[PDB]
Design a binder for this molecule. Structure first.
Ligand SMILES: Nc1nc(O[C@H](c2ccc(Cl)cc2-c2ccccc2)C(F)(F)F)cc(N2CCC3(CC2)CN[C@H](C(=O)O)C3)n1
Ligand SMILES: [Fe+3]
Length: 283
């Protein structure tokens, strides 16, 4: 027997609500605001335009802080693919210090560039359900903004993380392929296989480094959206190892701290080839 998995993009309607939600913990205004976003995600069905949100002034200020500081780091810290796509997003999707891009606009942009699209999501999906989205080039994205007290690092994914961390690499064909292949490999796989695939995803897509012209750069979205961890990953204080799926899949994923190790890939093409070799051995 194989567990249920989606067979078409609309089938994601059936898992995308199977979510662990928030529950700032004591802030009534923050909570109400978080409920508003969760409900927009819960009521979403494939085919809908993604609701456009009027962000508050404080939400926009938190975005601006994050945007401003990160943009000072990307030239020296981000991989070339990231920096190639970031200007196109400014131009077409309204990435500016004073404006939070809408998921709808970014979804349309990605659909033209790599066939990627966005679905809003209320909170954390299982690794299984999250990965299954990537199989159809669907990236589940949070829509709320991180609490204003922690602009530099948050343990929870927010819309800043999705927009600044993930989107610019989803716009890159080799990366989109890489991601989709993790998804495809996950469909109907065993729990053990999903866990391995999810860890490899975590140490590439979320926290990966790559070597470009001899220097370390970042492609991990969890690094690209955290001012403090981005600095930390290239500071010389972090432990780094070669990306190697059979090893990297055993690494524990840390949740409320900086990671204890970053994996370095040679290129998106090479990481993809490495995952292809690996997936054979767990099917
Ligand atoms: N994928 C991912 N995963 C997280 O959690 C894991 C996970 C948890 C729960 C569930 Cl239900 C699933 C996963 C799970 C789901 C997809 C695949 C594999 C693992 C795990 F705990 F395993 F590590 C946290 C996270 N974040 C946290 C928030 C930041 C991005 C990374 C870190 N700092 C950034 C910033 O400051 O901008 C934002 N990303
Ligand atoms: Fe992420």
């Amino acid at each position: 027997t194989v567990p249920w998995f989606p067979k078409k993009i609309s089938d994601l309607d059936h898992c995308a609500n199977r979510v662990l939600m928030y529950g700032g913990f004591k802030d009534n205004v923050y909570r109400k605001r978080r409920k508003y976003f969760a409900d927009l995600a819960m009521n979403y069905k494939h085919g809908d335009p993604i609701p456009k949100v009027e962000f508050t002034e404080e939400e926009i200020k938190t975005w601006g802080t994050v945007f401003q500081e990160l943009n000072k780091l990307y030239p020296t810290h981000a991989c070339r693919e990231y920096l190639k796509n970031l200007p196109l997003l400014s131009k077409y999707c309204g990435y500016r210090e004073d404006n939070i891009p809408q998921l709808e606009d970014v979804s349309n942009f990605l659909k033209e560039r790599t066939g990627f699209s966005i679905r809003p999501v209320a909170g954390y999906l299982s690794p299984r359900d999250f990965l299954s989205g990537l199989a159809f080039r669907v990236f589940h994205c949070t829509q709320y903004v991180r609490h204003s007290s922690d602009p530099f690092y948050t343990p929870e994914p927010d819309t800043c993380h999705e927009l600044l961390g993930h989107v610019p690499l989803l716009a890159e064909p080799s990366f989109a392929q890489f991601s989709q292949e993790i998804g495809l490999a996950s469909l109907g796989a065993s729990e053990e296989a999903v866990q391995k695939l999810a860890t490899c995803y975590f140490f590439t897509v979320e926290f990966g480094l790559c070597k470009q012209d001899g220097q370390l750069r970042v492609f991990g979205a969890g690094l690209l959206s955290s001012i403090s961890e981005l600095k930390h990953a290239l500071s010389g204080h972090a432990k780094v190892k070669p990306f190697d799926p059979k090893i990297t899949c055993k690494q524990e994923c840390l949740i409320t701290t900086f990671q204890d190790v970053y994996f370095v890939s040679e290129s998106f093409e090479d990481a993809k080839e490495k995952m292809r070799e690996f997936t054979k051995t767990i099917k």
